[PDB]
Design a protein around this ligand. Structure first.
Ligand SMILES: Nc1ncnc2c1ncn2[C@@H]1O[C@H](COP(=O)(O)OP(=O)(O)OP(O)(O)=S)[C@@H](O)[C@H]1O
Ligand SMILES: Nc1ncnc2c1ncn2[C@@H]1O[C@H](COP(=O)(O)OP(=O)(O)OP(O)(O)=S)[C@@H](O)[C@H]1O
Ligand SMILES: Nc1ncnc2c1ncn2[C@@H]1O[C@H](COP(=O)(O)OP(=O)(O)OP(O)(O)=S)[C@@H](O)[C@H]1O
Ligand SMILES: Nc1ncnc2c1ncn2[C@@H]1O[C@H](COP(=O)(O)OP(=O)(O)OP(O)(O)=S)[C@@H](O)[C@H]1O
Lengths: 705, 574
């Protein structure tokens, strides 16, 4: 009701300003058909929130407004609302269901198939059971008029678990999400609306590609949203970029104030006589002159900028009318083409893209407008992402592919020879990333045999190479219980049963870092409930969780960990591994998890025992390692005796099992506090070196000064 | 309290905007046997929800308002005033019963001879065994008049059906799943007014269809609801389409749930089972006998001699040649078009003939979880799955015997009780250990002596009822040399589609010489039989990656290129 505040937009949607959402029609179409059901017409769609969704309803509402239908159907109109508004927005306490009572006959009085509705409101259910309009729910069926709300997947079950007849008296469909790519066509088609807001040019592919890693780099904004954010944030980095010449606003303006005050302040002044006026004249000369070169020039930017914004307003203009022009179709066929002819457009756009054409055509020196007003390919986006994330063009500029092709040589540079192990995975990964597995099939493998082995780091670094991430990390306890994984995996409380928790490492962030690291651990470890989930967890297209009840497996990375090389390691007498040792290795677990999983296995391949010409390098990192990052150059010194020094601790370095991992800690701590010592007094503060000398094992080492 | 939550109906029957749907009249007549029925004045009716249990009670009113029936009870109160008035009485606590007590006087002493009806007995009595709905109900029920509820069975209802206030009170008389033929007589009687208010016009034969088909295959949504949907689903397309048939209304539905109706609309059954059979030949060659062995009770499946509850299946001989376990399920899918069928149970934990760990495992009496959640759930999931077995069963003979139950006969010994069925469930125990005797092969085929004996050695191995009934056989000569080879094109045509064939139409070429080299090596004597897939993909997938890397070419290609000497290194150029 008016007081009940029809959100009817079919008026503004008669005015049609909020614009044609696309793509779910077929659903909607049929859903609309469902919404026409002889028996119960009230489904819903459920899933991730916000975003294109009521827009569907709107888009629905559009096709609704779009008339032609089965007879009953355009015998409808709508509204929407909040009682959330009308909560106190109607009256004093007790009025939850209140105005429905009006609504009842308000519906039932003379009224055609007009349907208000609001979405999760149908939840009602602040807590427990509201049921007010659920009282009306049959009274709806009594009222014999559709209304539909909308929630996620999440709610209604519990609700229908509480209600039963609810969807028993209803239907559903569900969010499919837009088509990743083709989403953009809309988004493309969104521009003409959306551009005009802050009118500029647009380069497509960026936006698209933007959307990609927008989605990629920021998944958790839903397929439109993130773009919508781009879409937004586009306009953002655009926005002040549409401040006229913000730098050249204040920059050259100064030339006034520079020479301005002295136009008089020299007129009277204590200086050499008449040279005061000379400097008063000669700078005012350059004030007069130098002004001029930009003096019309800055405007003719802004002028023609206006000329843009002029035409931009025609751009603004055209559609408005065109909208309105096509609303006169609601004037039936009377004013359908009549006005639609009057608006012409042979030219109205032949106006447009030929108008700002020239000033786009004319490049000042280059690039035409420093307004640049257009898609700025990443940039903005980079910046966007930056403002979201940071880290540069490397992070921001890439192809797959190109991003990928070299990774090994990097990855090589990351840890160990493992060229194969690299290569295999690399490929496997590359080959993953290729025509890939489809999200359903995941990507995983395993090494073995040693700690201090960096394959984590590798992967970790790969994730960097993938995701820039050492950020995305997973630590999978397995052995730590057989009855485990309440916490770790889905269980926790997966029923909403008691004391809700679940996916303890996992579910919590599992989803929210869709982009995958993941682990398995040292051996068969504790428990088959791995096999349970690791089935799914490996199983192609795994979708489960607590109460979200979904893995959505797209980014597919665990590979995993496990090892037993005990003999095999020590068995191995040389850098490269002895043949069939592996085979000897094979049966070890592969008996456990068995061909089903052995198949289910993508593959698993392990690390050598790579020793020393290795370590001859490997040590190298540690120096560079810190230094490579360290700080950003406090003083930041090269400081090395290198193969002299390093070896000699590398001599200490290799722990057998652990290598210098301790020494990692134990290298520098040596060198370090001396740094403070070499921070203090009587020092030499440049980049220096190490000292190394020799008890038998007790060895001078230390540092220059 | 008078009309508020009430279903004022008999008028809407007496004025009759109700649309008669005339179902099973007996339980009504049975229900009619209430009118003066005393000791237990009423029965009940237990369906699953969607069945019009009250539409009955509605139809009852049609049996009523139309009168010329027993007027022993003549004046009427039929109307259910509960709704949610339970909590929905007022702004505070205590009035629920008032909410009915506020009903009591405006329902006070009966002039109108007719007992009314409230929904469930569990819509009755609110939660159940609660003051809500005047928990104790002689005084009115033995009193002014009565009412009726109704629900589905056991547990919640059973608890109060044992004693409570029903200690003296109603039985339950339960219409069936809507039966065979009437359902169109239903449907066609449903036609005129429902179809008259639905759209266009209409003709029979399609009406038959989903009727069968909802009846078919569709335990969930068995009710015409889907047809009733198909009804609206019908006008859905065309009435739209006309705004600007074939049961293909049902099609897209049958597309919706099946994934194509050409899967559902499809081989009818029996010839087509045999066409299925020959299509399984079309699937995988190898022992036609194996096929034919597998072909045996195919016809016996669903047809029945003594029961469909007969398990019909083709007892497996454990080994894996080609279709083996896999296509055995694929055909099992290719039965129902549904690949998913049944999982495998690891028998590792099953080692003894007993454990708390069993396909049932727990009885669900005391704390724990359900072991073998499969048939716990897999039927809650699904009818007619495949099954799961092992060449050494490490399973518990307990269940094996408890499934020798379901083994020999059809209905399986439901641990929690509820052999919901064995109807289409036809699957074969897969075991053999005789690999080294299985190792006895020469040429493409084996003459049977061994195949009697380790057989025999097994025939008595695990005790006979296992090996007693359930004929058909599974035989392994493997592939000889090539014949399997064709799997490659499969293996090929396994590629393109999985994601989109669009990705690569490039379709390449297999250079049999390689495929030889591939196969000959690539899969073991024994099996070693998976990986070349897992493998040859790769080095190719390299080129894939590769030729996708610097990316000069796009085409549809034929690879056919190849050179320890164990590698002549296939590859492919632009
Ligand atoms: N032409 C279009 N085609 C497709 N989607 C569109 C189009 N125009 C706008 N949208 C989407 O519509 C949404 C804006 O409408 P919304 O208000 O978000 O619908 P909704 O309210 O988000 O659904 P709810 O109520 O939020 S759960 C954004 O996600 C846009 O991506
Ligand atoms: N360049 C390197 N090459 C190999 N291993 C390295 C390298 N740098 C560090 N590591 C160590 O490798 C380990 C990283 O985990 P992994 O890749 O699993 O190898 P891992 O050593 O078996 O795992 P750990 O040692 O049990 S944490 C850590 O012990 C790191 O210190
Ligand atoms: N010939 C018939 N006789 C009796 N009932 C019928 C007949 N045809 C259809 N119905 C039922 O009438 C019902 C009308 O809708 P509802 O009763 O609200 O749904 P329902 O679940 O079937 O009813 P319940 O739960 O069984 S009381 C349909 O659901 C049909 O199951
Ligand atoms: N045409 C085929 N030729 C060979 N194997 C096939 C073929 N089609 C399916 N399979 C196999 O079917 C298997 C599933 O059934 P199983 O009988 O358990 O096989 P298996 O016992 O793992 O030993 P395999 O299959 O001979 S390596 C998969 O492992 C596939 O290798």
């Amino acid at each position: 009701y008016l007081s009940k505040y029809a959100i009817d937009m079919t008026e503004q949607a008669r005015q049609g300003k909020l614009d044609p959402v696309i793509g779910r029609e077929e659903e909607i179409r049929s859903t609309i058909r469902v919404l026409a059901r002889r028996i119960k017409s009230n489904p819903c769609l459920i899933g991730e929130p916000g975003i294109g969704k009521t827009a569907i309803i709107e888009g629905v509402a559009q096709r609704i407004i779009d008339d032609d239908v089965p007879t009953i159907l355009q015998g409808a109109k709508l509204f929407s609302l909040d009682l959330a508004a009308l909560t106190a927005g109607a009256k004093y306490k007790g009025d939850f269901e209140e105005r429905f009572k009006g609504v009842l006959k308000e519906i039932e009085e003379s009224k055609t198939l007009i349907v208000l509705f609001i979405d999760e409101i149908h939840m009602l259910m602040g807590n427990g059971k509201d049921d007010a309009a659920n009282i009306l729910k049959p009274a709806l069926s009594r009222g014999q008029l559709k209304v539909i709300g909308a929630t996620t997947n999440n709610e209604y079950r519990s609700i229908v678990e509480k209600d039963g007849a609810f969807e028993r008296r209803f239907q559903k469909i569900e969010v499919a999400e837009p088509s990743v790519r083709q989403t953009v066509a809309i988004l493309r088609g969104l521009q003409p609306k959306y551009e005009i807001h802050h009118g500029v040019r647009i380069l497509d592919s960026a936006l698209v590609t933007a959307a990609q890693l927008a989605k990629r780099y920021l998944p958790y904004r839903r397929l439109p949203d993130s773009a919508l954010d781009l879409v937004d944030i586009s306009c953002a980095g655009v926005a002040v970029a549409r401040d006229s010449k913000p730098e050249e606003l204040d920059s050259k303006e100064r030339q006034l104030q520079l020479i301005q005050v002295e136009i008089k302040a020299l007129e009277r002044d204590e200086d050499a006589d008449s040279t005061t006026k000379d400097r008063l004249k000669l700078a005012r000369q350059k004030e007069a002159s130098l002004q001029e070169e930009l003096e019309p020039l800055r405007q003719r930017y802004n002028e023609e900028k206006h000329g843009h914004e002029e035409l931009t307003q025609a751009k603004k203009k055209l559609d408005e009318l065109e909208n309105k022009a096509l609303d006169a179709e609601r004037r039936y066929d009377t004013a359908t083409a009549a006005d639609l002819r009057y608006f012409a457009i042979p030219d109205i756009k032949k106006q447009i893209e030929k108008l700002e054409d020239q000033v786009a055509e004319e490049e000042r020196r280059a690039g035409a407008n420093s307004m640049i007003q257009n898609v700025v390919d990443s940039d903005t986006i980079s910046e966007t992402a930056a403002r979201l994330t940071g880290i540069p063009v490397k992070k921001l500029s890439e192809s797959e592919n190109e991003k990928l092709i070299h990774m090994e040589r990097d990855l090589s540079s990351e840890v160990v020879g493992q060229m194969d192990a690299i290569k295999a995975v690399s490929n496997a990964v590359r080959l993953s990333r290729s025509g890939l597995a489809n999200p359903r099939q995941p990507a995983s493998f395993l090494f073995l045999g040693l700690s201090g082995s960096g394959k984590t780091e590798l992967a970790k670094k790969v994730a960097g190479f993938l995701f820039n991430d050492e950020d995305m990390m997973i630590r999978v306890d397995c052995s730590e219980l057989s009855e485990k994984y309440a916490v770790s995996k889905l269980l926790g409380t997966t029923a909403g049963y008691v004391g809700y928790d679940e996916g303890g490492f996992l579910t919590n962030q599992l989803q929210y870092k869709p982009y995958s690291v993941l682990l398995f651990d040292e051996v068969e470890k504790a428990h088959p409930d791995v096999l349970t989930v690791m089935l799914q967890m490996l199983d192609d297209g795994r979708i489960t969780s607590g109460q979200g009840k979904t893995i959505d497996c797209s980014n597919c990375i665990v590979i995993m960990t496990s090892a037993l090389g005990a003999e095999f390691i020590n068995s191995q007498q040389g850098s490269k591994i002895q043949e069939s040792t592996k085979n000897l290795v094979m049966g070890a677990v592969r008996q456990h998890f068995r061909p089903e999983f052995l198949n289910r296995i993508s593959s698993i391949v392990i690390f050598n025992k790579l020793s020393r010409k290795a370590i001859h390098k490997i040590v190298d990192i540690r120096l560079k390692e810190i230094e490579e990052r360290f700080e950003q150059n406090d003083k930041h010194y090269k400081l090395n005796l290198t193969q002299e020094a390093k070896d000699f601790l590398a001599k200490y370095g290799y722990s057998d099992d652990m290598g210098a991992r301790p020494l990692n800690r134990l290298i520098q701590n040596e060198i370090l506090n001396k740094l403070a010592l070499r921070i203090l007094k009587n020092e030499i503060k440049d980049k220096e070196t190490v000292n190394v000398v020799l008890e038998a094992e007790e060895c001078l080492e230390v540092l220059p000064n």
